[PDB]
Amino acid sequence: FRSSVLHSTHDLFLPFFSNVTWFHAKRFDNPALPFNDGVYFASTEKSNIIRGWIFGTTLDSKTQSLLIVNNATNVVIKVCEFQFCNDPFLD
Amino acid sequence: LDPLSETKCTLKSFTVEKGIYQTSNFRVQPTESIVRFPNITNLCPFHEVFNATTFASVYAWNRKRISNCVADYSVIYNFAPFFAFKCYGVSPTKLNDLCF
């Protein structure tokens, strides 16, 4: 906890006035975006569209993959050899 | 004994001139009691890792998350004589007096 102080820190942050990509997906068949040592996700929806993300190296059963899904009452986070398709989505 | 002897010891002499001539000491109020407040939990399942029949593979080492327990490392010393018990961040006799 800090108050009325000026603290200097050096870590992975989001640069100011940086050109960020705004996705409007609407269109399917969108390749996975790269993970360049941290990602900044932001959205202003109010219909519970985005409710999970996936993380991995090749997004297949060959390597490990992180599956994060947020439900209306709970959250499930599992690390397993998930075989991600070309367009993964929740039904 | 008295401030005179104290300033004599400070000046390292039996004769002190007129005036303060030095700073005597600094007042520091000490403690009078102790206040310990650890957490209140159940016994830690240390038998799940030590009292095990067979471990996993080297490339498939299992990581067991430990939380909400009273880590009593004194039960580990009475086991078989270990080959190398080396801690790189603390002393082996200071784990019981610290939190994690």
Binding site: F1, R2, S3, V5 | L1, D2, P3, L4, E6, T7, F14, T15, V16, E17, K18, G19, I20, Y21, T23, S24, N25, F26, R27, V28, Q29, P30, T31, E32, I34, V35, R36, F37, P38, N39, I40, D97, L98, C99
Partner: protein
């Protein structure tokens, strides 16, 4: 001792609003001055106890042995000594009463009798207050007083009056100024 953080401090129960993921708070010097109790969800600050410097005004040893005690930055009406045989012992000497306490802007002084008279500053203490060993109190002891800036004088200024001396006095003054010091040499391998 909450989570291994030992030391010396006094709990004050301030109104600091800590976040659920924050329990410890450090100052500019990275000294943890505020912690959260593990059991109770209240906020408690860690403030150091009574601290301050003490100076002993000592007169000439060949004259007398009575000395005074000065607590810099301490108020007389808050904590004069406030120990009973079970507190700090850096200075194993206690002066409780004796009509010798006096409150100054520099701190609490114990061992001097403040008088309304003004004399020349003998022993510098602070805040324009000085001490001296006077023998007009006859007993003799250390008294505290405000330094005298000089004798009060008033010039009879007038638009048609002038002062011209009729005689003079040849006065000689002495002034000593250092010119040189001791030249010393230091050997490296021998020291």
């Amino acid at each position: 001792n909450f989570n291994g953080l030992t030391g010396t401090g006094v709990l004050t129960e301030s109104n600091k609003k800590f976040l659920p993921f924050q329990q410890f708070g450090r100052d500019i010097a990275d000294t943890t001055d505020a912690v959260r109790d593990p059991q109770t969800l209240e906020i408690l600050d860690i403030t150091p106890c009574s601290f301050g410097g003490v100076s002993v005004i000592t007169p000439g040893t060949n004259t007398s042995n009575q000395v005074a005690v000065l607590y810099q930055g301490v108020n007389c009406t808050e904590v004069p000594v406030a120990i009973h045989a079970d507190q700090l012992t850096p200075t194993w000497r206690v002066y409780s009463t004796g009509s010798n306490v006096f409150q100054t802007r520099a701190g609490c002084l114990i061992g001097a009798e403040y008088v309304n008279n003004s004399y020349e500053c003998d022993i510098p203490i602070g805040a324009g207050i000085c001490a001296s060993y006077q023998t007009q109190t006859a007993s003799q002891s250390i008294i505290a007083y405000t330094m005298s800036l000089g004798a009060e004088n008033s010039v009879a200024y007038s638009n048609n009056s002038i002062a011209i001396p009729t005689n003079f006095t040849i006065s000689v003054t002495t002034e000593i100024l250092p010119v040189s010091m001791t030249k010393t040499s230091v050997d490296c391998t021998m020291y």
